[PDB]
């Protein structure tokens with residue numbers, strides 16, 4: 001049972017024991033419109049094989065990764081493996097990857113995956129290069145899991161852009177799992193709350209407990225410092 005291919009501090013692989021038992025009954029379509037590492041998407045596909053899965057993110061480089069893992073896994077794994085073999089100095093690997101700009105999907109996928117493994121917590125901007133990540137997270141064992149990951153996600157629909165599209169796309173027995181950037185360009189929580197109120201599907205939001213979040217989502221069901229916010233009774 002594959003848990004994670006990507007490292008995110010706000011990853012939900014540990015929260016699954018709380019999330020999975022509280023999915024709505026009979027959902028046939030799963031949407032993750034802010035997928036990031038997609039712990040929940042990976043878990044749902046492995047526990048419910050007949051569900052249609054749609055994942056989305058605003059982060060173009062992250063979506064290049066997911067599309068290239070789905071569509072081009074052999075080439076992606078081989079290029080990542082070659083770079084791991086050739087760049088024995090992690091700081092020089094970092095400097096090489098961070099100095100690249102632009103690229104097609106494949107180049108973006110390779111760069112995104114390796115930066116995810118060699119950074120402090122998965123991103124350049126939130127702690128930069130970590131020698132500890134380079135030695136203990138950028139491992140053959142993590143690379144080895146990409147082939148199984150590519151198999152799990154083969155029939156995923158994958159898009160880049162705003163979460164609104166998957167909120168409002170018509171469909172039947174749709175469940176939407178939302179894990180926004182934590183509550184403080186920064187994420188517009190007011191726009192999010194405004195759009196989710198009009199979402200015609202069943203949804204669950206994960207937020208850190210805050211009075212500001214309790215107030216913004218007073219209209220909804222809040223369950224207990226982590227919150228599950230839903231429009232269906234658990």
Ligand SMILES: C[S@@+](CC[C@H](N)C(=O)[O-])C[C@H]1O[C@@H](n2cnc3c(N)ncnc32)[C@H](O)[C@@H]1O
Nearest residue numbers: 010011012034036037038039058162163179181
């Ligand atoms: C807390 S992370 C969710 C990660 C996911 N739960 C996991 O297991 O890794 C929030 C995500 O929201 C994405 N995001 C931010 N603004 C967005 C937007 N307007 N539309 C879609 N995704 C967005 C970020 O790129 C980030 O990947």
